[PDB]
């Protein structure tokens, strides 16, 4: 008798489908100003690829999605 | 060297140091700014600008709305590119910067060795950077991190690719633009804005495409006369 | 002690053998450099003559070495360097080495990332493995926690301190850069 499969079959593919340091001078410190070069954090912007009344409705749903 | 708050809408010039009020509250140095000790050096002429997050802890953010033409590979920016060649697995694409960026044959949506993408030299692309730094050549990708190309990949064909100023983009992509809204009423279209001053446009016919590209490359300072003139022209196409 | 000259004979083959900086002609050896000669003797009693220009006599960074270097160029693949101190004795003949991607940490994880381990213009120390064949490209490795970056200058001009394994900070202002800190 038997109830379960075998392994050699159950392997096939169609089936599966350091250290640290404490500086009292600089232990609990954090940067107060940070250098950025991105106009996004800086400023809000829409999604590049868009469309107006019909061309590539896929881009229209992308607009609806990413612009909120 | 005074009153960062009093020159948030004035024209600052390089060399100028400006300092900000206070124990303190973290802030961030914009692209056109730089840090000297506890002060902010200016590195580019610009109408200074500030912003704050809806909260009250974030502090603020500063920058200069500088207009220019040359692009610099930055991280997390959607950018058009022009494949310049292919070396084995990776093919090098131009962006408009110091050096050409690199893609990988398995970065596009759904690709493996037995499924390669159709990218030919001269083909144009809409990707974004994941390593953009001054010390290493920039690598870009045409797929979100989750694993889906949310509009990325090859552009297509049958369109016009031109180039404009970067501030023009930074303005047009604003949600309160009048030109790009009014255009959605005269004749349809579909366009890619690339943060490298490079723009792609398509419509049904070609006269329309040309009128549109001219508008865009001129819309920085168009007069109402020319405005309604080209609007009437589009209405008559 | 005697200084020799690129033409003078030194000895028959029956009284020595060429070690370096020499050559052989019929039944004789002949120097090839302006320098000092020396005939070493093995337990075999047959001497090995050689000639040396002790200005820069000779150095050799062997496999199990510990050599410093400076990070000039980098890539997502490897980072190239220049050899300055082999141990502690400098060598004006700056050799050129390389550090691979995976050969960067003892854990060998592929998650490693150059731009977060190294930067161009900082000094590290590593262990050479392969001498190289064509360009003598030394390949160095840092698969150890007391290896890697030791001194590193800040965003612009400040020297930082190695706080932790993959963190470094400047003492004047506060900003956490990422490297393969040593020790």
- Where do we find the tokens 């040396």? C52
How many contacts (CB atoms, under 8 Å) link A and B?
A: 99
* Overall size of chain A counted in residues: 68
Sign, CA torsion C115/C119/C124/C126: positive
Could you write out the DSSP letters of every residue in C69-84? EEEEEE-SS-EEEEEE
Query: How many beta carbons lie within 10 A of that of residue B163, not counting itself?
Result: 13
CB-CB under 8 Å, B190 with A49: yes
Say how many CA atoms lie within 13 Å of A1 toward its Cβ. Answer: 1
Q: Which chains touch C (3 or more CB pairs under 8 A)?
A: A, B
CB-CB under 8 Å, A32 with B27: yes
Q: Is B109 on the interface with C (CB under 8 A)?
A: no
Q: Please report, to the nearest 10 degrees, the dihedral formed by the alpha carbons of residues C46, C51, C55, C61 taken in order.
A: -50
Quick one: which of C39, C51, C34, C32 has its CA closest to C15?
C39
Q: Where are the domains of chain B?
A: 1-72, 73-149, 150-237
Q: Where are the domains of chain C?
A: 3-52, 65-177
Q: What is the CATH number of domain C65-177?
A: 2.40.50.140
CB-CB under 8 Å, C173 with B131: no
* Overall size of chain C counted in residues: 183
Where in chain C does DSSP place strands (E)? 17-18, 22-25, 28-31, 36-41, 47-52, 67-74, 79-86, 89-90, 96-99, 123-130, 138-141, 148-151, 161-164, 167-169, 176-177
d(CA B235, CA C17): 98
Q: What is the CATH number of domain B150-237?
A: 3.30.1370.10
Distance from CA of C172 to the nearest CA of B (A): 8
Q: Which long-range contacts (CB under 8 A, 24 or more apart) does C143-147 make?
A: C143/C103, C143/C104, C143/C105, C143/C106, C143/C108, C144/C106, C145/A18, C145/A19, C145/C106, C145/C182, C145/C183, C146/C182, C146/C183, C147/C180, C147/C182
Distance from CA of C50 to the nearest CA of B (A): 47
Q: Round the CA-based radius of gyration of chain C to a whole number and report it.
A: 23
CB-CB under 8 Å, A23 with C161: yes
Query: How many beta carbons lie within 10 A of that of residue C118, not counting itself?
Result: 23
Provide the chain B residues 22-41 that lie in CB contact (below 8 A) with chain C.
35, 37-38
Sheet holding A33-35, edge to edge: A33-35, B27-29, B61-64, B46-51, B11-12
Find residue B117's DSSP bridge partners: none
**Cited resolution, angstroms:** 3.5
Q: What is the CATH number of domain B1-72?
A: 2.40.50.100
Domains C3-52 and C65-177 share a fold: yes
Domain B73-149 is found in CATH 2.40.50.140: yes
Q: Round the CA-based radius of gyration of chain B to a whole number and report it.
A: 21
Q: Which CATH class is domain C3-52?
A: mainly beta
Residue C161 · residue C172 · CB < 8 Å: no
Domains B73-149 and B150-237 share a fold: no
CB-CB under 8 Å, C175 with A31: yes
Residue B202 · residue B156 · CB < 8 Å: yes
Residue C5 · residue C39 · CB < 8 Å: no
B19, B83, B92, B155, C87 from B122: Cα distances, Å: 48, 5, 11, 12, 51
């Amino acid at each position: 008798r038997k109830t379960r499969l075998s392994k050699n079959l159950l392997r096939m593919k169609f089936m599966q489908r350091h250290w640290y340091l404490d500086l009292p001078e600089l232990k609990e410190k954090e940067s107060f100003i940070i250098e950025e070069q991105s106009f996004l954090l800086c400023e809000d912007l829409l999604y590049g690829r868009m469309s107006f009344r019909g061309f590539n409705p896929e881009v229209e749903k992308l607009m609806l999605q990413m612009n909120a | 060297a005074r009153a960062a708050r009093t020159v948030l809408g004035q024209v600052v010039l390089p060399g100028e140091e400006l300092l900000l009020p206070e124990s303190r509250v973290r802030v961030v140095c914009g692209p056109g700014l730089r840090r000297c000790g506890d002060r902010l050096l200016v590195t580019k002429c610009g109408r200074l600008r500030h912003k704050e997050p809806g909260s009250g802890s974030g502090g603020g953010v500063y920058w200069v709305d500088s207009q220019q033409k040359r692009y610099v590979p930055v991280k997390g920016d959607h950018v058009i590119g022009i494949v310049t060649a292919k070396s084995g697995d990776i093919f090098k694409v131009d962006v408009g910067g110091s050096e050409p960026a690199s893609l990988s044959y398995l970065s596009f949506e759904g690709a493996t060795k037995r499924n390669r993408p159709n990218v030919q030299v001269g083909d144009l692309i809409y990707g974004q950077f994941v390593v953009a730094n001054k010390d290493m050549e920039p690598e870009m990708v045409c797929i979100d991190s989750c694993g889906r190309a949310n509009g990325m990949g090859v552009i297509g064909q049958d369109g016009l690719l031109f180039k404009v100023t970067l501030g023009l983009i930074r303005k047009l992509l604003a949600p309160d633009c009048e030109i790009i809204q009014e255009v959605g009423k005269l004749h349809p279209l579909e366009i890619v804005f690339g943060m490298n001053g490079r723009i792609w446009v398509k419509a049904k016919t070609i006269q329309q495409t040309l009128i549109l590209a001219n508008i865009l490359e001129a819309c920085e300072h168009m007069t109402s006369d020319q405005r309604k003139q080209i609007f009437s022209r589009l209405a008559e196409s | 002690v005697r200084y020799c000259i690129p033409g003078e004979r030194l000895c028959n083959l029956e009284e020595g053998s060429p070690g370096s900086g020499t050559y052989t002609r019929h039944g004789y050896i002949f120097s090839s450099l302006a320098g000092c000669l020396m005939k070493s003797s093995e337990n075999g009693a047959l001497p090995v003559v050689s000639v040396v220009r002790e200005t820069e006599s000779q150095l050799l960074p062997d496999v199990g070495a510990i050599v410093t270097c400076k990070v000039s160029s980098i890539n997502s693949r490897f980072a190239k360097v220049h050899i300055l101190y082999v141990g502690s004795m400098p060598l004006k003949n700056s050799f050129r080495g390389t550090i691979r991607k995976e050969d960067v940490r003892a854990t060998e994880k592929d998650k490693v990332e150059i731009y977060k381990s190294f930067r161009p213009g900082d000094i590290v120390l590593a262990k050479v493995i392969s001498l190289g064949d064509a360009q003598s490209n030394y390949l160095l490795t840092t698969a150890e926690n007391e290896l890697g970056v030791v001194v590193a200058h800040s965003e612009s001009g400040i020297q930082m301190v190695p706080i932790s394994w993959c963190e470094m900070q400047c003492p004047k202002t506060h900003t956490k850069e990422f490297r393969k800190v040593a020790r």
